[PDB]
Amino acid sequence: MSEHRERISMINPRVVLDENGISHRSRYFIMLCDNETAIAHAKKTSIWAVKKDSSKRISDAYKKASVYFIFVAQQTYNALGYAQVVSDLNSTELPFWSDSSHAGGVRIKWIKTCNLFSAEISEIVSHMDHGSEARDGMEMMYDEGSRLCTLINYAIMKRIGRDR
RNA sequence: CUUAAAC
């Protein structure tokens, strides 16, 4: 994490971080996608099924923070987009594709969608778990989430990796 | 206008 100085982001010095490099106001989770149908449907319908392992932390983060999902292909590490979580976990509105690994659904608001290869994105994702590959549904640091948002935005504005 | 958000 950032060792900039109390602890602050290395991208924006006004963002104060906890001792895990997380901002209490803006929080970021990686969704590793291995199912073309699921990601395709989520891009059309803006509903996502949340894995049981990550569901409680995501739900708790939603209480007091803006919460974002960053979608990455598990096998290729292509960035698929990012979205804000705009509903808490619920059992009322589930995607048809959810199964026993999922706790329930959330509504998302897509900010960007893409199918993007970026070697910096790949390197971030490869080292996201304290230097090892990202685990599905893990929270990342403020600066990782911000940098990924920036890279996706940059690619899109350069007309690279667009899906629309 | 596929303009990250927040600060």
XYZ file of C-alpha atoms (C1' of nucleotides) in Angstrom:
171
model
C 0.000 0.000 0.000
C 0.744 3.705 -0.117
C 3.229 4.873 2.479
C 2.412 8.514 1.623
C 1.477 10.794 4.549
C -1.888 9.826 8.469
C -1.863 7.347 5.572
C -3.005 8.728 2.231
C -3.387 7.551 -1.376
C -0.309 7.839 -3.621
C -2.613 9.064 -6.449
C -4.741 11.595 -4.501
C -3.251 12.961 -1.242
C -6.714 14.023 0.018
C -7.865 10.361 0.275
C -7.095 9.014 3.758
C -6.578 5.236 3.881
C -6.809 2.606 6.615
C -3.927 0.205 7.412
C -5.024 -2.026 4.487
C -4.856 0.892 2.002
C -8.665 1.035 1.733
C -10.675 4.253 1.651
C -13.817 4.190 3.844
C -15.747 6.235 1.199
C -14.870 4.429 -2.100
C -14.355 0.662 -2.160
C -13.427 -1.726 -4.945
C -13.972 -5.440 -5.502
C -12.692 -7.639 -8.340
C -15.194 -9.924 -10.101
C -13.253 -12.622 -11.974
C -15.484 -13.757 -14.839
C -15.188 -17.218 -16.371
C -18.673 -17.365 -17.987
C -19.419 -15.565 -21.276
C -23.182 -15.895 -20.709
C -23.056 -14.311 -17.220
C -21.011 -11.259 -18.219
C -23.044 -10.798 -21.449
C -26.346 -10.921 -19.530
C -25.034 -8.569 -16.782
C -24.070 -6.037 -19.454
C -27.658 -6.154 -20.857
C -29.613 -6.429 -17.557
C -27.341 -4.709 -14.951
C -27.899 -7.499 -12.370
C -24.986 -9.457 -10.878
C -24.948 -12.569 -8.662
C -22.553 -12.229 -5.705
C -20.494 -15.205 -4.511
C -21.131 -16.515 -0.993
C -17.476 -15.982 0.042
C -17.420 -12.224 -0.720
C -21.123 -11.382 -0.089
C -20.874 -10.271 3.583
C -17.872 -7.970 3.058
C -19.493 -6.401 -0.038
C -22.807 -5.926 1.800
C -21.015 -4.324 4.778
C -18.991 -2.040 2.454
C -22.257 -0.877 0.873
C -23.470 0.566 4.261
C -21.083 3.545 4.261
C -19.122 3.599 0.979
C -19.606 3.973 -2.715
C -18.895 0.403 -3.884
C -17.526 -0.589 -7.309
C -17.095 -3.901 -9.084
C -14.222 -4.188 -11.533
C -14.873 -7.056 -13.959
C -11.879 -9.041 -15.235
C -11.804 -12.252 -17.328
C -10.323 -15.018 -15.138
C -8.390 -16.786 -17.903
C -7.135 -13.824 -19.964
C -7.123 -10.857 -17.502
C -8.919 -8.688 -20.059
C -10.786 -5.823 -18.343
C -14.519 -6.257 -19.015
C -15.743 -3.040 -17.379
C -16.594 -1.508 -14.090
C -19.843 -0.617 -12.396
C -21.129 0.868 -9.191
C -23.137 -1.374 -6.902
C -26.556 0.372 -6.656
C -28.392 -2.159 -4.501
C -27.431 -4.190 -1.465
C -27.576 -7.980 -1.576
C -31.067 -9.370 -2.024
C -32.875 -12.621 -2.803
C -35.681 -10.956 -4.810
C -33.899 -10.198 -8.057
C -31.473 -12.963 -9.161
C -29.923 -13.524 -12.633
C -31.103 -16.746 -14.342
C -27.424 -17.843 -14.320
C -26.915 -17.877 -10.529
C -26.134 -21.180 -8.801
C -25.158 -22.584 -5.387
C -21.878 -20.570 -5.235
C -23.899 -17.316 -5.014
C -25.516 -15.706 -1.959
C -27.920 -13.462 -3.876
C -28.085 -10.625 -6.363
C -27.165 -6.960 -6.616
C -28.103 -4.242 -9.087
C -25.162 -2.491 -10.741
C -24.786 0.725 -12.765
C -22.250 0.278 -15.551
C -19.716 3.129 -15.803
C -17.631 1.554 -18.563
C -17.817 -1.681 -20.525
C -14.964 -3.089 -22.602
C -12.992 -6.124 -23.678
C -9.552 -4.706 -23.070
C -6.065 -6.080 -22.777
C -3.750 -3.802 -20.834
C -0.431 -5.127 -19.587
C -0.636 -2.775 -16.579
C -4.141 -4.090 -15.769
C -2.830 -7.677 -16.101
C 0.112 -6.867 -13.785
C -2.147 -5.217 -11.186
C -4.513 -8.198 -11.207
C -1.590 -10.717 -11.104
C -0.221 -9.136 -7.882
C -3.459 -7.990 -6.195
C -3.341 -10.589 -3.377
C -0.266 -9.253 -1.537
C 1.830 -9.971 -4.656
C -0.053 -13.075 -5.896
C -2.972 -13.484 -8.327
C -6.320 -11.892 -7.428
C -8.829 -14.091 -5.603
C -12.417 -13.818 -6.857
C -14.424 -11.190 -5.001
C -11.507 -9.808 -2.974
C -11.443 -6.171 -2.071
C -8.477 -4.275 -3.525
C -6.746 -1.152 -2.286
C -8.090 2.344 -3.096
C -5.106 3.018 -5.405
C -5.549 -0.284 -7.263
C -9.267 0.410 -7.870
C -8.571 4.004 -8.886
C -5.747 3.015 -11.232
C -7.858 0.300 -12.882
C -10.720 2.802 -13.383
C -8.225 5.242 -14.913
C -6.734 2.628 -17.271
C -10.133 1.474 -18.462
C -11.217 5.118 -18.983
C -8.008 5.849 -20.863
C -8.334 2.834 -23.156
C -11.918 3.737 -23.951
C -11.134 7.343 -24.776
C -8.324 6.089 -27.075
C -10.888 3.819 -28.803
C -9.081 0.668 -27.592
C -10.922 -2.378 -26.276
C -14.410 -0.987 -26.825
C -17.321 -3.438 -26.818
C -19.939 -0.907 -28.034
C -22.290 11.835 -23.844
C -18.874 4.536 -22.608
C -17.028 12.537 -19.850
C -15.316 7.329 -13.189
C -16.815 8.719 -8.355
C -15.362 11.141 -4.177
C -12.093 15.085 -2.202
